[PDB]
Amino acid sequence: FPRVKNWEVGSITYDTLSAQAQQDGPCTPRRCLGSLVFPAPEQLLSQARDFINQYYSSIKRSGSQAHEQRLQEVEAEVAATGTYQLRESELVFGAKQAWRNAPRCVGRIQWGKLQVFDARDCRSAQEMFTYICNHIKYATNRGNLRSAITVFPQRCPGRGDFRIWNSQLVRYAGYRQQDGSVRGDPANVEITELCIQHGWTPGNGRFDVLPLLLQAPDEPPELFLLPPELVLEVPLEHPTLEWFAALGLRWYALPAVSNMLLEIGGLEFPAAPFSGWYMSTEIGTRNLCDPHRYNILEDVAVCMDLDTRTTSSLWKDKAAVEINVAVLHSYQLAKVTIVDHHAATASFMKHLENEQKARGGCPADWAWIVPPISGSLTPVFHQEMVNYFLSPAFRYQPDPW
Amino acid sequence: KFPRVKNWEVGSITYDTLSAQAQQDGPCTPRRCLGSLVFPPEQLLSQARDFINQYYSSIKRSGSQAHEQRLQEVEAEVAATGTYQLRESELVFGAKQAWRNAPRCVGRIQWGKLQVFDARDCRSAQEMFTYICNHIKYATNRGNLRSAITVFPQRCPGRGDFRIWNSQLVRYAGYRQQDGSVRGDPANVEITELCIQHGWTPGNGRFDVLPLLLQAPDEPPELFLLPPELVLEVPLEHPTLEWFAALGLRWYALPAVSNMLLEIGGLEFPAAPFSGWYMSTEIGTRNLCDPHRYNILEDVAVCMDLDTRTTSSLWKDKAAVEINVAVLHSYQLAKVTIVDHHAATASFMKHLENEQKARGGCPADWAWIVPPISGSLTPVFHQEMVNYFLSPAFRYQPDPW
Numbered sequence: 015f016p017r018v019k020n021w022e023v024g025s026i027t028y029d030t031l032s033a034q035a036q037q038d039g040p041c042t043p044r045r046c047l048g049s050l051v052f053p054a055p056e057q058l059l060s061q062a063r064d065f066i067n068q069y070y071s072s073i074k075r076s077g078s079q080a081h082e083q084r085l086q087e088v089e090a091e092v093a094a095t096g097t098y099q100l101r102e103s104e105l106v107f108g109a110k111q112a113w114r115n116a117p118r119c120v121g122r123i124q125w126g127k128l129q130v131f132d133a134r135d136c137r138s139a140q141e142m143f144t145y146i147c148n149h150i151k152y153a154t155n156r157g158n159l160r161s162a163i164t165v166f167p168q169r170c171p172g173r174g175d176f177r178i179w180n181s182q183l184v185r186y187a188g189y190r191q192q193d194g195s196v197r198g199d200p201a202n203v204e205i206t207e208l209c210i211q212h213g214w215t216p217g218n219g220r221f222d223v224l225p226l227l228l229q230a231p232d233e234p235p236e237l238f239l240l241p242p243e244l245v246l247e248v249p250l251e252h253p254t255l256e257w258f259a260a261l262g263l264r265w266y267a268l269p270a271v272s273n274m275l276l277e278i279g280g281l282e283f284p285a286a287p288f289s290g291w292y293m294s295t296e297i298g299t300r301n302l303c304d305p306h307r308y309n310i311l312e313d314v315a316v317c318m319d320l321d322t323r324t325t326s327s328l329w330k331d332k333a334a335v336e337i338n339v340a341v342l343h344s345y346q347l348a349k350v351t352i353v354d355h356h357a358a359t360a361s362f363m364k365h366l367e368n369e370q371k372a373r374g375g376c377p378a379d380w381a382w383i384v385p386p387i388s389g390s391l392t393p394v395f396h397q398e399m400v401n402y403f404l405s406p407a408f409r410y411q412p413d414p415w
Numbered sequence: 416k417f418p419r420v421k422n423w424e425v426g427s428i429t430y431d432t433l434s435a436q437a438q439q440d441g442p443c444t445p446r447r448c449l450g451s452l453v454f455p456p457e458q459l460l461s462q463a464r465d466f467i468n469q470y471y472s473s474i475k476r477s478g479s480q481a482h483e484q485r486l487q488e489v490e491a492e493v494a495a496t497g498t499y500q501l502r503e504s505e506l507v508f509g510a511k512q513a514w515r516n517a518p519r520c521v522g523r524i525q526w527g528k529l530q531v532f533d534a535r536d537c538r539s540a541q542e543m544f545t546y547i548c549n550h551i552k553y554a555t556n557r558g559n560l561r562s563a564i565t566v567f568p569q570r571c572p573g574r575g576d577f578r579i580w581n582s583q584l585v586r587y588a589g590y591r592q593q594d595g596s597v598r599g600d601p602a603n604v605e606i607t608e609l610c611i612q613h614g615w616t617p618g619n620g621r622f623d624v625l626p627l628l629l630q631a632p633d634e635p636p637e638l639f640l641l642p643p644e645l646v647l648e649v650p651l652e653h654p655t656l657e658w659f660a661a662l663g664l665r666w667y668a669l670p671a672v673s674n675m676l677l678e679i680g681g682l683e684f685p686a687a688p689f690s691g692w693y694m695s696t697e698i699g700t701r702n703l704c705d706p707h708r709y710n711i712l713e714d715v716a717v718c719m720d721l722d723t724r725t726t727s728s729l730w731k732d733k734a735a736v737e738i739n740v741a742v743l744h745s746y747q748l749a750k751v752t753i754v755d756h757h758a759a760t761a762s763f764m765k766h767l768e769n770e771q772k773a774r775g776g777c778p779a780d781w782a783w784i785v786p787p788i789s790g791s792l793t794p795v796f797h798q799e800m801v802n803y804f805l806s807p808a809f810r811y812q813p814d815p816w
């Protein structure tokens with residue numbers, strides 16, 4: 015079992031949980047591909063059996079009558095129908111485990127506090143839209159954000175999938191421009207073109223909230239506009255740089271990933287959007303300063319009167335720090351939940367300790383856990399980590415178009 | 416079978432066909448990735464044959480007279496002696512190749528410019544010391560640093576090794592107290608206690624340059640005082656924070672790793688110190704701000720009058736940026752070669768491009784190439800990388816005790 019060192023303290027542990035990793039990753043003894051972003055009844059039965067075992071362990075009933083009854087029920091149902099249905103309590107536990115198991119999530123200290131909305135009865139794209147609006151309203155909670163997931167019907171033979179085409183529930187449009195540039199968010203050029211192609215009347219601002227493209231089984235996607243008062247946004251200002259407000263920057267309160275697949279005991283839920291709250295570097299560093307996103311770094315450093323003609327002035331570093339200050343200050347001013355990268359990484363360290371005691375390890379992706387500014391000033395930098403795949407899980411899936 | 420490698424800033428794609436040559440298997444398996452871990456008789460002919468083939472291809476001389484002749488002499492040498500001696504040019508070529516192959520080195524754009532001192536006829540810790548002294552004075556070059564390596568005799572059966580007990584040629588002492596904690600560099604507490612134990616009169620200071628412990632085969636070590644005028648150091652001041660100088664901080668000019676083992680064509684050199692010049696985050700971020708190193712971050716924030724009461728002021732990030740600024744300003748004022756993390760990572764992207772054309776890929780350790788501050792502000796953050804072991808190589812090796 016892999017030995018894992020923390021270099022700040024000197025601590026050493028062994029990740030025995032990795033030995034139970036079922037599915038395979040991209041690395042081999044020849045070559046590590048850790049840094050890559052994107053790496054049958056009997057086999058459904060064996061996944062389902064393992065998950066039912068996990069559920070009954072969690073409720074201190076391993077080996078009991080009800081445990082064997084459920085194992086028997088599942089096999090009989092797979093034999094009769096080729097699939098099976100989760101009980102409500104099994105779904106809640108499986109959604110929480112999927113979050114717990116997610117190696118790229120630094121916020122997992124919260125994994126047990128998750129509101130699970132059971133939308134497995136959803137019938138249409140119109141009902142899907144109503145469920146999603148309720149999710150946004152509950153999770154946003156006027157700025158006091160609450161973690162939640164809404165679970166739409168599982169994949170099943172004989173019918174297409176429910177899908178949300180948008181990558182998050184709230185996203186800003188990206189408009190390919192006159193001179194070939196992009197106005198708005200360049201990460202969203204494709205979904206923006208698809209919304210237009212499906213009848214949306216575009217805007218032409220930098221922060222235009224996108225409509226939703228929702229797909230019911232065996233139906234083309236259907237366009238739904240979000241009511242503006244459902245989408246809470248934060249205008250960005252800086253506590254001491256008063257010209258920062260004149261940049262006209264904004265971001266939205268709710269980070270709600272909507273394009274991932276939830277897998278529980280062999281069953282697959284292609285539509286299951288989940289939401290927490292932001293860590294400030296996601297907005298301040300990646301979304302606003304990535305060269306292929308809003309790319310504001312040089313404009314901010316020029317306004318700060320930094321010497322941008324030489325790298326060794328560290329003008330890039332200084333401007334990025336103040337952009338992250340602006341994000342934190344603005345969300346706090348607006349009373350919208352946010353966590354900074356120091357507090358978030360410290361709480362992740364507590365999670366690793368909790369998980370070492372509970373399960374003997376924790377799957378973690380070092381390159382995603384370490385924040386994109388001030389990496390080695392956070393404790394996770396000095397923590398060796400072991401990356402592997404446990405189920406239940408959130409998985410990437412192909413775009414439906 | 417050839418890993419696809421994407422750059423996410425630009426969208427470009429390459430394939431690492433070079434990876435299909437990795438000898439020493441790394442630590443990862445399909446089951447789990449250990450990429451974040453710091454530390455994971457006639458088979459000599461196999462590695463010697465392959466290395467000689469490497470040599471003659473690099474000089475466009477595969478399949479011709481001189482190439483075949485050299486194959487037989489190593490064959491006869493190993494048959495007659497159980498080992499072989501490298502030609503001078505091969506020793507040079509192998510030193511540059513080991514540098515070129517180091518997955519954790521961001522400065523490899525320089526790999527063709529390397530001064531190779533051949534100390535293979537050395538015998539005794541006294542000869543070592545004068546060799547080390549020639550290197551240090553050559554490499555330092557009054558602050559116009561020049562990359563250099565010195566190659567002490569190779570390992571052979573039945574006889575002890577040449578070893579430098581220090582991890583670098585210049586290290587600062589670390590002294591315990593009436594209370595455990597360390598004055599000086601906590602990373603060197605152990606070699607400090609060895610040097611004192613072997614007869615060295617310790618100092619009282621936070622920046623005492625340690626003596627050398629040099630080990631000829633089969634003899635206990637011998638202490639050597641480095642000539643004070645040969646160890647070039649930089650007192651640290653800040654361009655605009657006039658009190659920063661009063662903190663009394665300094666760092667040395669020459670980074671010279673002296674504890675790694677150089678392997679060429681199956682030959683092992685446990686004493687082969689190599690040196691380049693510093694990238695400024697090594698000093699300003701890791702050495703001065705790591706919690707287990709000089710840990711100066713809060714002292715600098717106090718002097719800057721920052722609000723250390725809340726993490727979301729980003730007082731840690733601000734003080735760290737100014738410490739890096741002070742390192743760069745001080746080294747440039749002293750006319751001592753240094754490179755900032757923006758310049759260095761941009762040069763590495765060019766190196767990746769060169770290596771793609773020259774060899775079809777480049778072994779790179781993402782977690783070590785990405786700098787420890789401002790990670791996503793540098794281009795290497797957005798570049799996927801493949802990590803694997805090629806020979807010749809620099810390898811880690813046990814402490815000589």
Ligand code: HEM
Pocket residue numbers: 109113116118119120121122124128161162163288289290291292293296353358382408
């Ligand atoms: C409660 C506060 C939360 C915080 C502060 C947080 C933090 C983060 C951060 C910073 C990332 C990296 C994302 C990126 O760089 O694009 C991430 C990824 C992720 N989070 Fe969390 N998260 C939270 C809640 C949740 C919840 C509620 C779930 C699911 C129930 C979840 C599941 C995931 C998954 C699956 C990923 C990986 C996504 C990907 O690879 O694209 N997180 N989280």
Ligand code: HEM
Pocket residue numbers: 510514517519520521522523525529562563564689690691692693694697754759783809
């Ligand atoms: C010329 C300027 C150079 C620069 C700017 C540079 C930069 C760096 C940096 C920042 C690291 C990371 C090490 C750490 O974080 O502790 C590193 C590692 C390394 N470099 Fe370079 N380097 C240079 C020259 C060289 C030379 C001349 C050699 C050998 C001939 C070399 C071989 C290595 C090796 C083997 C490592 C791995 C160190 C380890 O794993 O402990 N580098 N380099």
Ligand SMILES: Cc1cc(N)nc(CCc2cc(CCN(C)C)cc(F)c2F)c1
Pocket residue numbers: 051181182269270271288289290291292293296
């Ligand atoms: C629930 C939650 C909380 C939080 N605090 N942050 C997030 C952001 C997740 C996220 C991941 C990515 C990786 C894309 N990569 C796979 C190509 C892209 C995104 F656009 C995105 F939003 C989610």
Ligand SMILES: Cc1cc(N)nc(CCc2cc(CCN(C)C)cc(F)c2F)c1
Pocket residue numbers: 453670671672689690691692693694697
């Ligand atoms: C030639 C050269 C040039 C340059 N610019 N930098 C270096 C840094 C080498 C180096 C490696 C390490 C890793 C060992 N540790 C993680 C266990 C630690 C250090 F403190 C250190 F200095 C070398």
Ligand SMILES: C[C@H](O)[C@H](O)[C@H]1CNc2nc(N)[nH]c(=O)c2N1
Pocket residue numbers: 049050051381382383423796797798799800
């Ligand atoms: C190429 C590299 O893997 C890529 O840029 C990764 C690195 N680490 C990351 N970490 C987080 N949290 N989010 C990301 O999008 C990325 N991107």
Ligand SMILES: C[C@H](O)[C@H](O)[C@H]1CNc2nc(N)[nH]c(=O)c2N1
Pocket residue numbers: 021395396397398399450451452453782783784
């Ligand atoms: C645990 C982790 O692997 C360790 O802290 C690594 C991370 N990346 C690094 N990168 C560099 N350049 N140098 C280091 O010492 C480290 N340390």
Ligand SMILES: [Cl-]
Pocket residue numbers: 269296301
């Ligand atoms: Cl986001």
Ligand SMILES: [Cl-]
Pocket residue numbers: 670697702
């Ligand atoms: Cl160093």
Ligand SMILES: [Gd]
Pocket residue numbers: 254255256
């Ligand atoms: Gd002001």
Ligand SMILES: [Gd]
Pocket residue numbers: none
């Ligand atoms: Gd402007």
Ligand SMILES: [Gd]
Pocket residue numbers: none
């Ligand atoms: Gd003062």
Ligand SMILES: [Zn+2]
Pocket residue numbers: 041045046047048443447448449450
């Ligand atoms: Zn790996």
